[PDB]
Amino acid sequence: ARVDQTPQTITKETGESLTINCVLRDSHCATSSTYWYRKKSGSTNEESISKGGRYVETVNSGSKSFSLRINDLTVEDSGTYRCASECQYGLAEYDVYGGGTVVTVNAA
Amino acid sequence: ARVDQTPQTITKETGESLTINCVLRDSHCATSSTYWYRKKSGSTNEESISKGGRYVETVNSGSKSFSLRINDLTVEDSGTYRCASECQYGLAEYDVYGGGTVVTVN
Amino acid sequence: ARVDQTPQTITKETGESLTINCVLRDSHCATSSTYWYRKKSGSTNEESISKGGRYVETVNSGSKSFSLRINDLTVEDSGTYRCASECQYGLAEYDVYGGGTVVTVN
Amino acid sequence: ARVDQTPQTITKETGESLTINCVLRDSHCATSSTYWYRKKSGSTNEESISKGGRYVETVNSGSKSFSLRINDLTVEDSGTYRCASECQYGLAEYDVYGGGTVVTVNAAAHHH
Amino acid sequence: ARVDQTPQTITKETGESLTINCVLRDSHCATSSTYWYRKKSGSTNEESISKGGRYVETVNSGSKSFSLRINDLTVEDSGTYRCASECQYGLAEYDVYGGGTVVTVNAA
Amino acid sequence: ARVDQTPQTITKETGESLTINCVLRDSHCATSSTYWYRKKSGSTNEESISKGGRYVETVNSGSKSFSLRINDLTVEDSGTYRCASECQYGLAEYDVYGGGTVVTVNA
Amino acid sequence: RSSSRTPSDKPVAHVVANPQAEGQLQWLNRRANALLANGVELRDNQLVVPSEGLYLIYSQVLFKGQGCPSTHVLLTHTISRIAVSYQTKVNLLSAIKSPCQRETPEGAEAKPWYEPIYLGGVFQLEKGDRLSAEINRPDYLDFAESGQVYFGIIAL
Amino acid sequence: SRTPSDKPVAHVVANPQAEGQLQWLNRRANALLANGVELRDNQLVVPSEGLYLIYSQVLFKGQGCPSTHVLLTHTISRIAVSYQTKVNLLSAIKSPCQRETPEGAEAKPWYEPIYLGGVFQLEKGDRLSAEINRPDYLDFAESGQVYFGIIAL
Amino acid sequence: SRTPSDKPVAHVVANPQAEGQLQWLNRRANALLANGVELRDNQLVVPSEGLYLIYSQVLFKGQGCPSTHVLLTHTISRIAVSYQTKVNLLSAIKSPCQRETPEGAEAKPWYEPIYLGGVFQLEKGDRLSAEINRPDYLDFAESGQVYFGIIAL
Amino acid sequence: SSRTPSDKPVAHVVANPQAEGQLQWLNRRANALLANGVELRDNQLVVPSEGLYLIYSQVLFKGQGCPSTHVLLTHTISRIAVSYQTKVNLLSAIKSPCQRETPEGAEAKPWYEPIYLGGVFQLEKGDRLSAEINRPDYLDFAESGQVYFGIIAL
Amino acid sequence: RPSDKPVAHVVANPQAEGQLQWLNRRANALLANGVELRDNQLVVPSEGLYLIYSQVLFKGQGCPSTHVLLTHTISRIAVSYQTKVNLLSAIKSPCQRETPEGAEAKPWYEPIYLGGVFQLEKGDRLSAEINRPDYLDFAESGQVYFGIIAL
Amino acid sequence: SSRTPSDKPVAHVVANPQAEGQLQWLNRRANALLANGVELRDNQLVVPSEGLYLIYSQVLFKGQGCPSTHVLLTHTISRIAVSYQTKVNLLSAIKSPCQRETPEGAEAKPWYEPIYLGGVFQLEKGDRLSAEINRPDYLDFAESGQVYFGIIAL
Amino acid sequence: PSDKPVAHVVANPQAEGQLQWLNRRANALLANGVELRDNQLVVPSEGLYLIYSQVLFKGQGCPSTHVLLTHTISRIAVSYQTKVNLLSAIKSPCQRETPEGAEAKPWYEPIYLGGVFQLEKGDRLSAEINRPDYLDFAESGQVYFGIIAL
Ligand SMILES: [Cl-]
User: Fold this and answer.
1) Number of alpha helices (DSSP H) and beta strands (DSSP E) in chain C
2) Domain Ig-like, which positions (chain F) (predicted)?
3) Residue I16 CB-density burial (10 A; 0-12 exposed, 13-18 middle, 19+ buried)
4) Residue C50 DSSP symbol
5) Which end of chain E is more exposed for a tag (fewer CB within 10 A), N or C?
6) In this structure, what are the phi and psi dihedrals at residue I96, rounded to the nearest 5 degrees?
7) Nearest C-alpha of chain J: how many angstroms from K116?
8) Integer Cα distance of G41 and F105 in angstroms
9) What are phi and psi of H58, to 5 degrees?
């Protein structure tokens, strides 16, 4: 584990807002180096979500938890979203991931 | 975003040892030309760390990741440290940087 | 180091093009007086590569960087390529070099 | 490529001192038989600079490099300066040259 | 310097051949009236080298340059060799010289 | 191969002179403290060749090579002749070997 | 460590302003999505054409100011050529733009304005020609963000 | 038909029936999308590595002049297989409403166009996207006034 | 003359001594019209079917801003052999003076440039034309401020 | 915060689980290490300093049946030294993957065979060690620590 | 270029066909800082914590019907207790079927590795041994070995 | 380009690292100087004007083990003058690197011994200074400014 | 009134295992613009300088293997911002013969470096040694370091 994505299945409507929460269970990972990746349904590329604008990120260093709220949802924001963190203790440095899926339907 | 320096802020005490890790995210930059730079608080010079002795560099090209462990820390080692790399694909040639600050208390 | 040759090892196939890039770190060397030398594997002659035709040189004085693209590669172009520059400040006059090996397989 | 004059374009201020360095690339030319010529902008005649006083020449036969430091620059010292050397091997004897331009700008003498 | 003797210092072995070259820098001196002089170290006599046999002379009137190749060198041929030429333009008549030294080492 | 014997399998009737060369490839081996061995008609064991004598040894530390000129060639025996050297770096101590065959007939 | 994995030719250049230049337009090639290869040399913020032929020349500049210190400010952007055949600076592509419409922020405070200018055309160039992309007001350049100001040529 | 022709090319034009959005179309008269360039999620997908010429123009049209200083942007982005982050290759910003915010009436249309063009090296699988921040000021009426395309030079 | 030739190309410039006219010229310094491209009636005639890059710039200048409310347009049009109706390939609109006849300050010269460019497939005999709606504000004074061209890509 | 100061060049690298059928070594994963100078160039470890090292590696082979009897499983640690520029084996092991009965019908038999190597050696500056296998199509890096390779400065 | 501490890595002699003999003067083998090689026995030169390890590769060209048992043991005789005791041992049966017979071809290889940490005293003699030294494969390099290192 | 002028005869030459077994003096390296009239002829410095000069030189000797007991390393700066045409020593030093020893049972013992010389002198026009050593086979011009030689007009 | 930048710094004797340069000591100088920053001398003006330093090493016996005593003067310049050696020297104090269970034999080995160089404004000089545990700062003027603009 070491990271737990909370909403594994989300289904929202066009014009909405999804929050994906990740909690660190490994006490060596830093909530300072948070990363978000989207892979649009049908694509073989994991893209890097850039924290800014529609993507608001909330982090708490005490509970080792961070979230990713996305506003103005379209139908192009449907895919598999993963979170990431950079962990490092004494001589060891590694990274960790999760997993959790988003599907958005239109309003018609 | 092309190179991710992970320890962005460290505060260690005199005598200890800080490790700075950088991970390449662009598959065109090469781990064969990695560079390190420090800028001591109060100086206007970016100095280049020489790879040897107190400055040990560990590289893994499979993960496109390199590290820089500094031992025997003084208070003269307080400054902003950056990593660098040389990229070349087709007709393109560029370089990449990061960011991260160090403070040592005596 | 004074002058930084970036592609230290290149391995191309007959009929392609290798680009070797050099960046100046000493601000007294001029992007105007650049030189290139190759020494073919197994021979004791360092030849001076001339700029024209198959040997293309790209210079940028702003970045103090020059490159050398070699086209129509044959199997007789296997050797070690170095770049050079003429530096001058006050009473000091010197030149600078790099290093990097090329092997072409047919 | 047979004598390499390095400072190609120089611009100094009146009352200063420029050094021109030339490196021999032909290993048959001698650093003992070195010659210097300047051609003032706009005139057609290569005059030969003499070795002494204001024209100081530094030579190293080990690397086969020679230089010409010129002091007390005026505005009449603006021209194209070339270096030369005398080469000799077996039955062959030849000479070699370079190239490099100097422009000197005036001091303007501040009036109170 | 009007006329430039090029090989200033020479050191060859017994049985060799030294070439001494002079180039005219005064455009009034002629390659037709060229002269050669040898002066053995320790002697106060400047001798006149004769053109023939061991003394071969190469002239180019276009470049106003002449040379003097000396063959069958002995150890008694060690001295200062000078070249000369006679110049004339208007009411002017003069001659020109150079400078250059030779030392030959023996064998057994 | 750490040691390279160049002159190997050969049939030289009794009476000949030619050096057998061994070249060191491990830069820890020394051109000194070297010993030579020849077989015993290729039937039983290898013999330990002594110093000088009917055997010639050429040593040059610059080229990291030693040789064996077959002088005063009588019928001593046939077999595979080996060269050897004593190598040692820091905490390591090891040795290297060779091999090369000579066959002698008579008149 | 990696290796190159494409062959290509025809002199090309796409140089972008240096963000760490403050109040001047210094052209760079050693940055992510910029090119300067196959013979084109950049001397004194000038591109030197390496071979004769037909080129496509383009450049864009972004002007930004946080107020108009006068109602008579003129912004220009020109690509010039000094040729070996005729050694005089002549303009190949040029444009002018008036940024402040009767204001010189007088009745109100400062106000950030943005105005871009783009140039492009096809020309025949010879070897040794020195092309220069130039602007008259280098203090209004906004090379902060990404590819907002650039300049390049490509041999067709 | 006639000449074969190749070189990956694309010149897509805005959808006129696309309210508050910039939807790129390819099957409309003097517009092209052939020889490997595919149109994915309002994005052009480069089919082969090489040097391309990238261009786009957008025309912004509005009837009013609110919110003091409004900023109109137009950027061409590239997400490459080598570096999977959206980065701007060409970008421009423009302020259409001059300081003076009209006080008194309600009718005076302003027009501001923006054009971008440049040469770039694209690799297999690169996805370029031309986007603007305010799709409510689009003039997708008329002719070739808003467009976006690439061609392999 | 020293070097080879290439392909149909054109870069025509406005005539400076042609008042109130957008007369295109080719026999002028740094201007081209070669390899079959013809300039007949201010129109470029395509000599071969293929892909062309069409571009043009116009500079508008006026020596005062009245509240006339003028709309400046710039369009490149195409009359093809297949469809003999003039259709616009590239277009842009711009409003240069957003004022109400400035009373106090006199003159105040305004300058507005407009650039158009794109790639299209043209056939033999197509006639392209660069045109402006108000040639009474044109600034064809100095070099390369107005131009129009095609190049066979 | 790396509160623990420690030294001696060390490495414990694990195979890449997401690398189809190839042995790519990783260090940026859970309980794996690569620090104090050891470099991973091309699935090869570069010794950062001269001294005595302990070298170890394990490979676990899995196949979904034995079709042919022509399969030999190897696991070898090789060394290219500056003093002797030829790859020589330091530790080697061979194992017969399918004893017999070569599954004729209704095969459906996943077989598992591990191999472990370890020993003490003297390495010099610049020595390049590489752990290699014969058939990287039998690699089972699906679980956790079933395939690994490391050195430690003693 | 210093040293370290008691260490040993000895490998079987390839030119001892059909026997196990540990050698120290061979390529990439160690025996230094006091460890002695007696009669195929390592003599611990100092009291302390040691790491003992050994690998053997057994190879045969045929499977007999005797249920072959391959054994490998590292033994220790101490000054305090003068008897051979096993510290590390393992047993393995390589041949399961009833000999190749019908298809006479059984090129089988089976390795065994042992390792552990122990406290050893001065003069203790350690020995790595196998029960059937007729299947030993010292054909290649570093396939059979035995060593100790002072931790 | 150049900056502030600066003057006086000056020289600081560094050994050629690529010269194998010989002492070749160079000036075309980073921190080396040769300006304002000083000529380097046949590995000799020629004074351009009469005055007081400061002479200095360092040589670093290294050998891999001690062969001879009677090994003596020398380093001298010599002067042949126009007034007295005989080469005389201005500065000299002698050093014996090996006190007997001659390692019989050992593993080579690399020794390093440097030698430094310096002094102020009055020199005349045309005088030739020369830095020489008796055994140029022990020169260690490897890393940096380990061997150098210079004069400066004070 | 003596101008020209000058510096002559001497080691701190009451410094635990370290080479700390002092300037407010009897026969030491640091004036006319040379500043001693982070144990480094900062050149204040472009010109020709004479750089020198001496270090004295003392040990109470020859331990294991060979010790290499090195002494180097480095320069990190504004033009090329990497520490490069201007002067260097190496010395092996122990001629093998490590004390074979007998008594010690204190060895002394000093090392001196000096030369003329062209320095620019802002160049940072540092005199340094590898083993600050063999420093013998017991007396005065046994280890020192200085420059003077000639
Ligand atoms: Cl004098």
Assistant:
1) 0, 10
2) 1-82
3) middle
4) P
5) C
6) -85, -30
7) 12
8) 76
9) -130, 140
What is d(CA G82, CA D60) in angstroms, rounded to the nearest whole number? 41
| Interface membership of K112 toward F (CB under 8 Å) | no
CB-side neighbour CA atoms (13 Å) of G38: 17
Going by their DSSP bridges, the two strands H72-79 and H87-94 should be labelled as: antiparallel
Strands A9-13 and A100-105: parallel
**How close does chain C come to B8, measured CA to CA in Å?**
27
Resolution stated for this PDB structure, in Å: 3.4
Coil vs helix vs strand at E59: strand
E strand residue ranges, F14-100: 19-24, 35-38, 47-48, 55-60, 65-70, 79-80, 82-89, 92-96
Query: In one letter, which amino acid is H56?
Result: S
Q: Hey, which chains touch D, using 3+ CB pairs under 8 Å?
A: C, E, L
Confirm or reject contact between I118 and chain H (CB < 8 A): yes
Which residues, other chains included, contact J42 with Cβ-Cβ below 8 Å and sequence gap of 6+?
Answer: B61
Residue count of chain A, please give it: 108
Residue in D3, D93, D30 with CA at minimum distance from that of residue E10: D30
Give L36 to chain C, closest Cα distance, Å: 8
Residue G36 has which token pair? 């300067």
Which residue from K71, K73, K10 is spatially nearest to K43, judged by alpha carbons? K10
Residue among I152, I127, I124 nearest I53 (CA): I152
Query: Taking the mean position of all CA atoms in its chain, how far away is CA L20?
Result: 16
Residue type at D15 in one-letter notation: G
Distant-in-sequence, close-in-space partners of I17: CB < 8 Å, separation ≥ 6: none
CA torsion through residues J13, J14, J20, J22, sign = positive
Residue F77: phi and psi, rounded to 5, are 175, 165
Residues 30-89 of F with CB under 8 A from J: 89
**8 Å CB contact of C90 and M118:** yes
Nearest to F39 by CA among F26, F48, F31: F48
Strand E101-105 vs strand E9-13: parallel, antiparallel, or unpaired? parallel
**Rounded to an integer, what distance in angstroms lies between the CA atom of residue J13 and that of residue J26?**
5
Locate K91 and state its tokens.
Answer: 């047993």
Alpha-carbon distances, residue M112 vs B24, H71, M53, M57, M86 (angstroms): 46, 68, 6, 11, 13
- Taken in order J25, J28, J31, J34, the sign of the CA dihedral is positive
Secondary structure (DSSP) of B9-60: EEEEETT--EEEEEE---TTEEEEEEEEEEEETT----EEPPSBTTEEEEEE
Phi, psi of L125 (to 5 degrees): -65, 135
Closest CA to M109 of M73, M143, M65: M143
> Could you give the angle at the alpha carbon of J64 between the alpha carbons of J60 and J65, nearest 5°?
110
Composition of chain M by helix, strand, coil, percent to 5: 0, 45, 55
How far is C-alpha K67 from the chain's CA centre?
Answer: 22
Tell me the one-letter amino acid at C94: Y
Parallel, antiparallel, or unpaired for β H9-14 and G130-135?
unpaired
Task: Give the amino acid at E14.
Answer: T
Q: What does the buried/exposed string (b/e) look like for B73-90 if buried means 16 or more CB atoms within 10 Å of the residue's CB?
A: beeebbbebbbbbbbbbb
d(CA B49, CA B35): 8
How far is the centre of ligand 1, averaged over its atoms, from the C-alpha of L81 (Å)?
14
Interface of M with L in 68-97 (CB under 8 A): 68, 72, 75, 80, 84-92, 95-97
Nearest alpha-carbon partner for A98 in A32, A10, A25, A11 = A25
CA distance A31 to A22: 10
